[PDB]
Structures are given as structure tokens and as C-alpha cells.
Amino acid sequence: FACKTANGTAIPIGGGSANVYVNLAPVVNVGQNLVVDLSTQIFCHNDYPETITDYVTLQRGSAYGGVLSNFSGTVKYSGSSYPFPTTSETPRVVYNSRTDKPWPVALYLTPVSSAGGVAIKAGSLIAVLILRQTNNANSDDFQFVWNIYANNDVVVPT
Numbered sequence: 001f002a003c004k005t006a007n008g009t010a011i012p013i014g015g016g017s018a019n020v021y022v023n024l025a026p027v028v029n030v031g032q033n034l035v036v037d038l039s040t041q042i043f044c045h046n047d048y049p050e051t052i053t054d055y056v057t058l059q060r061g062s063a064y065g066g067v068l069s070n071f072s073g074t075v076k077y078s079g080s081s082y083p084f085p086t087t088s089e090t091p092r093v094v095y096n097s098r099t100d101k102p103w104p105v106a107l108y109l110t111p112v113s114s115a116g117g118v119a120i121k122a123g124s125l126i127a128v129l130i131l132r133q134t135n136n137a138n139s140d141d142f143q144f145v146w147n148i149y150a151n152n153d154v155v156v157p158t
């Protein structure tokens, strides 16, 4: 089991960390949400699907930068909604092919009344998402750590 971003930045068997750079709507009013889909940019696969079933959770999601200070959030994982920042681990998604399959995570962020300016800074860390992988074969229990960076400034009009 290993993962990589859409541009091929990889985390190998056993886990580790990688950076993910996301485009963000450049102007978000206080009545709109800022949506950060990560499923189009984070992918994983199973290295021995003939035998092993891999199980993958969102173990934790933490907010940084302007997302932490200027937005409130939820995260959807595999079609279910949770608070963001998270409070506990989600249920599992199965990975059962050597072909890359998306990691089904997206953030839904709402400006808080204080927002703001600049609401999110280009190049800044905005989230850290921990993917936890186990299987039905052995003791492997690995963290894949995704550091999410904003590509661009986001302005919240006032």
C-alpha cells in the first residue's frame, strides 16, 4: 500500500509525508463556502490485492494558517460529514487494486465573522490530514501525512 498526489509526489509502503498544493477560489464572501476537494489530488493503491485487503481512514484533520483563524469547517470522507478540525477517526475505505484510486476527502470551509484579510496566504500551510492504513493480513498500521498548502491568496470581502 502506497499513495501519491496527482503530480506523482509519493509516500511509500510504511507511510511518511508529502505536500499537496491546492488551488482555492480567490474571492469568498461570508455567505459562500470555500471547498477544497482533495480526492482529485491524493491517490492510493494496494500492492498485493490478490491476497490482502487494505483499509484506510481519515485519522485526523487539523487546520493551519488562515483556514484555522478565518474559517469554520467540516470534512467529508467517503460521503459522510465530520467536524473540521476532526475529533476522532472515521470508518474505513477499502483499497483492493494496484491501480490508483482517489482518497475521498474534501474540506468545506465557511468564513467566520472576523474574516477578514488576507483570509488565506499563497504558499501557506492550511491543513494536515493523516491517513491511517491497516490491512487484514498483519500488524501494519501506518500513517500517511498530507501537508496541504494554498497555491494562492484568498480574499474575503468586508
Ligand SMILES: CCCCCCCO[C@H]1O[C@H](CO)[C@@H](O)[C@H](O)[C@@H]1O
Binding pocket: 001, 002, 013, 014, 045, 046, 047, 048, 049, 052, 053, 054, 134, 135, 137, 140
Ligand atoms: C507472499 C507475501 C507477500 C507479502 C507482500 C506484503 C506487501 O505489504 C505491503 O502491501 C500490502 C498491500 O497493499 C499492505 O497491506 C502492507 O501494509 C504493505 O504496505
Ligand code: NA
Binding pocket: 005, 006, 007, 008, 020, 021, 041
Ligand atoms: Na497534485
